[PDB]
Paper text:
Recent work identifying the biosynthetic gene clusters for formycin A 1,11–13 pyrazomycin 2 (also known as pyrazofurin)14,15 and showdomycin 316 has laid the foundation for obtaining an enhanced understanding of two new enzymes ([name] and PyfQ), both of which catalyse C–C bond-forming steps in C-nucleotide biosynthesis. The function of [name] and PyfQ was originally assigned based on their homology to the enzyme (4-(β-d-ribofuranosyl)hydroxybenzene) (RHP) synthase, which mediates a key step in methanopterin biosynthesis. These enzymes all utilize 5′-phosphoribosyl-1′-pyrophosphate ([name]) and an aromatic carboxylic acid to make the new C–C bond. The liberation of inorganic pyrophosphate and irreversible CO2 release provide the driving force for these reactions. The sequence of [name] is distantly related to homoserine kinase (<20% identity), a member of the GHMP kinase superfamily, although there are regions of strong sequence conservation.
Residue numbers in the entry:
A (entry chain A), B (entry chain A): 11 to 171, 180 to 205, 209 to 341
The structure:
């Protein structure tokens, strides 16, 4: 049995979504320990693939992947037990991350030492984002540079959409705690919404790159907490595309974001994609704990925990 | 004797120079083999420091640095022979690069294995740019994230100005040739000019970050030659601050840039800082050679050569 552990992906924002930029997409993101993945891959005695833990959507994709990889690497039929599943469609990058974790695990069970980028590609993942792919096996803080726009992009709708973008920035995240918040956000509809908001104005695409590459990244690099928070907040309460994500989601997340900005125990707060997960940074975590406990009791958030960044990516060890 | 070789620094552009951005400065740059530095540091028998090769400006700073480092590391008086000096104030980053090269060399002569960032700082270098500091001992292609703007930046003139910025992006440069061009550019006056052009509009600061981080860098990362050139050109013929550098310099460089854009054997061209050095990229270097030879004969450029990127930084070896 191979026992794989992997961090969740928290996303800051999408970058280039205008009708005239050289490239499209591009994502700033970081990895954290909780919520985490823990799965155990081993030989199925009867010779039939199996998947335990996790919801039906990923459960089938897990099986399809393991069926695929079986004949790819000529390995055995494998049972995987997801002991700790990453919350699905909650803004944690669960599908990409689990698939790569289990995939890498099934590889180690065989002989192979797979490349996660080509594995992601094999399994149909990372056709918009390199975030979760990058964050497996590097962890930390990264920004991928998206995809090159073809000559006939002046028209767009290619923003909606194989080749998973490599990280153009990749840094260790400082030893700062991260407060995770489960809001009452929900998870067609958005396909329609996406076309109503995008393509965004060029100025904003540019500005987002500015806040990501000349705000977030240098501050992470230099371990400047104040500078880091100033950039996280400016993205959250000001990022054109982020605002659209927030506004669409509604009061359920907006109230929590606003409360964090108000709260003096919270130095910055963010939404991860659209999914209910928000996250926050604080130099007074003891005060923040009490604030989030207060929020959870009142029923404005479902849950909260502190975690820390993962600067490794996934990790495997052989057990029995 | 320690024999040190170091690459030149070619600069693409300065990034954030507006009155309201989170950070200021920020520089995209690459390292090349020619023009290069080659120096040899050894013990001065008579016990008096000495500097041969190079112009009077760096010659004294070389000595001051070696005097400084002598009592810092309690080492011997050292003679340095600059066998191949980097052209001074020509847009090659000669001062920073030589100082760090010779400094690192004098260190190896002693016992120490110096950090180039703290060495740069010790020698008063890299108070605007991390370009040449970064490019010593990493080489390749990098972008530094500048400096954090203080609360009282709304007013500016802090854009003119110790802590040398670390590289937020650092990548191997692909195996593409680089055509270097010595134009008839010249090298107070610009101190005045700088205040007339800066601070630049915010939109442009943002846009420059966009072309650097979502243009240059991903293309370098993915080794996409067409994408790379599209971004280099957009910076050169469109970069607000770059245009100001070009326009100020005048016909001497402008004519060469325009000729490269016209020339079908040149896929992209750039100015390095303001200094006479321009550089260009081509997928038909054989045709480009003939174009530059033609230019040099007519007297529109002083000289030209092809070189390639350095992906190491400086290098030392012990000789006698
Ligand atoms: O390949 P990744 O970097 O993970 O991201 C790809 C997509 O998945 C994300 O959803 P979410 O964060 O909810 O993850 P999940 O849908 O897989 O649960 C988000 O909607 C991205 O567009
Ligand atoms: O510390 P660096 O990254 O080298 O760059 C610092 C400064 O030096 C450069 O001049 P130039 O490229 O002409 O080099 P030189 O003046 O040292 O010759 C340029 O004017 C930069 O503002
Ligand atoms: Cl804690
Ligand atoms: Cl060549
Ligand atoms: Na707050
Ligand atoms: Na051309």
């Amino acid at each position: 049995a191979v026992r794989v552990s992997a961090p969740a992906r928290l996303s800051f924002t999408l970058i280039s979504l205008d009708g005239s930029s050289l490239r499209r997409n591009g994502i700033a993101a970081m990895a954290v320990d909780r919520p985490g993945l823990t799965a155990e891959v081993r030989e199925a005695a009867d010779g039939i693939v199996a998947v335990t833990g996790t919801a039906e959507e990923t459960a089938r994709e897990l099986a399809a992947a393991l069926e695929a990889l079986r004949k790819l690497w000529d390995g055995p039929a494998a049972r995987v037990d997801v002991l700790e599943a990453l919350p699905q469609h909650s803004g944690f990058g669960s599908k990409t991350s689990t698939l790569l974790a289990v995939g890498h695990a099934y590889g180690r069970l065989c002989g192979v030492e797979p490349d996660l980028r080509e594995l992601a590609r094999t399994l149909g993942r990372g056709r918009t984002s390199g975030a979760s792919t990058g964050l497996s096996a590097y962890g930390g803080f990264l920004v991928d540079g998206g995809h090159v726009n073809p000559p006939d992009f002046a028209e767009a709708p290619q923003k909606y959409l194989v080749a998973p973008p490599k990280p153009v920035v990749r840094l260790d995240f400082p030893d700062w705690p991260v407060l995770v918040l489960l809001t009452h956000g929900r998870h067609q509809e958005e396909l329609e919404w996406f076309h109503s908001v995008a393509p965004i104005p060029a100025e904003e695409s540019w500005r987002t790159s500015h806040l990501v590459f000349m705000g977030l990244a240098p501050a992470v690099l230099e371990q400047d907490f104040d500078a880091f928070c100033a950039a996280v907040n400016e993205i959250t309460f000001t990022g054109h595309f982020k605002q659209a994500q927030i506004a669409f989601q509604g009061d359920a997340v907006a109230d929590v974001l606003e409360a964090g900005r108000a709260a003096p125990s919270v130095d910055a707060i963010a939404l991860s994609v659209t999914g209910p997960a928000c996250f926050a940074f604080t130099k007074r975590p003891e005060d923040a704990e009490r604030w989030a406990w207060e929020l959870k009791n009142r029923g404005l958030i479902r849950d909260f925990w502190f975690t820390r960044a993962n600067n490794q990516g996934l990790a495997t060890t052989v057990v029995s």
